[PDB]
Design an enzyme around this catalytic site. Structure first.
Site, PDB file in Angstrom:
ATOM      1  N   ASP A 186       2.620 -44.637  10.564  1.00 30.66           N
ATOM      2  CA  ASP A 186       3.686 -45.607  10.771  1.00 30.66           C
ATOM      3  C   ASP A 186       3.146 -46.957  11.253  1.00 30.66           C
ATOM      4  O   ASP A 186       1.963 -47.187  11.319  1.00 30.66           O
ATOM      5  CB  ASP A 186       4.873 -45.028  11.578  1.00 30.66           C
TER       6      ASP A 186
ATOM      7  N   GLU B 110      13.143 -47.770   6.566  1.00 27.27           N
ATOM      8  CA  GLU B 110      12.040 -46.855   6.762  1.00 27.27           C
ATOM      9  C   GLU B 110      11.255 -46.524   5.527  1.00 27.27           C
ATOM     10  O   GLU B 110      10.116 -46.053   5.651  1.00 27.27           O
ATOM     11  CB  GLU B 110      12.603 -45.524   7.314  1.00 27.27           C
TER      12      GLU B 110
END
Ligand SMILES: [Cl-]
Ligand SMILES: [Cl-]
EC number: 3.2.1.17
Length: 162
Positions: free
Chosen positions: A20, A11
C-alpha cells in the site's frame, strides 16, 4: 454513486498481494493484511481471511467478499464509537459516505483523533472543517484522495468523483 463505488475508485482493485502507499501488505480493494515486513506472514493472514490455501492470489469474488465485510465493519465501528456516532448521526447521506471513507482508510481510532474537525462537521461549518482537515499527515501523504474526501464534506455532492 454510493459508498462502494466511491471506495472502489479510491483503493483500486488488485488480485495479488501488493504494498500500500505506506508499504504494507494488502490485497483486493484496500484490505490491509499485516503491518509486518514478512511476506510469509502476509500470505498466512490471507489464507486465514479466505479459508483456502491461496498462495497470494485471489479471485474477483473473494476480493468483493472481503470488501463487503470491510465496509460493514467500518459502519459498525462508527456506530459503536462514542466520538464518531454523534457526528455520523448529524450528517446528510453524502457526507456520511465521506466519514465512512476516512474510517475505512485510517481506522476508527485514527479518525476519532481529529477532534477539532469533527466538532466543526457537527456544527455544519463546512468551509472551516475543510481547512482544518487539510492540516494533517493524511492530506500531505495522500493528497489527491484527501482532496476528494474533503470536497465531499465541503459541498455535500459527488462532484469530486464524477
Ligand atoms: Cl478478515
Ligand atoms: Cl492520493
Amino acid at each position: 454513486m454510493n459508498i462502494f463505488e466511491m471506495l472502489r475508485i479510491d483503493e483500486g482493485l488488485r488480485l495479488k498481494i501488493y504494498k500500500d502507499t505506506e508499504g504494507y501488505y494488502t490485497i483486493g480493494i484496500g484490505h490491509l493484511l499485516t503491518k509486518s515486513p514478512s511476506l510469509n506472514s502476509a500470505k498466512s493472514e490471507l489464507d486465514k481471511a479466505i479459508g483456502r490455501n491461496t498462495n497470494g492470489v485471489i479471485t474477483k469474488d473473494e476480493a468483493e467478499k472481503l470488501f463487503n465485510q470491510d465496509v460493514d465493519a467500518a459502519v459498525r465501528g462508527i456506530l459503536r464509537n462514542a466520538k464518531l456516532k454523534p457526528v455520523y448521526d448529524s450528517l446528510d447521506a453524502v457526507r456520511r459516505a465521506a466519514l465512512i471513507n476516512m474510517v475505512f482508510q485510517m481506522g476508527e481510532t485514527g479518525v476519532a483523533g481529529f477532534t477539532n474537525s469533527l466538532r466543526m462537521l457537527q456544527q455544519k461549518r463546512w468551509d472551516e472543517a475543510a481547512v482544518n482537515l487539510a492540516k494533517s499527515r493524511w492530506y500531505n501523504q495522500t493528497p489527491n484522495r484527501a482532496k476528494r474526501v474533503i470536497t465531499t464534506f465541503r459541498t455535500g455532492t459527488w462532484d469530486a468523483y464524477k
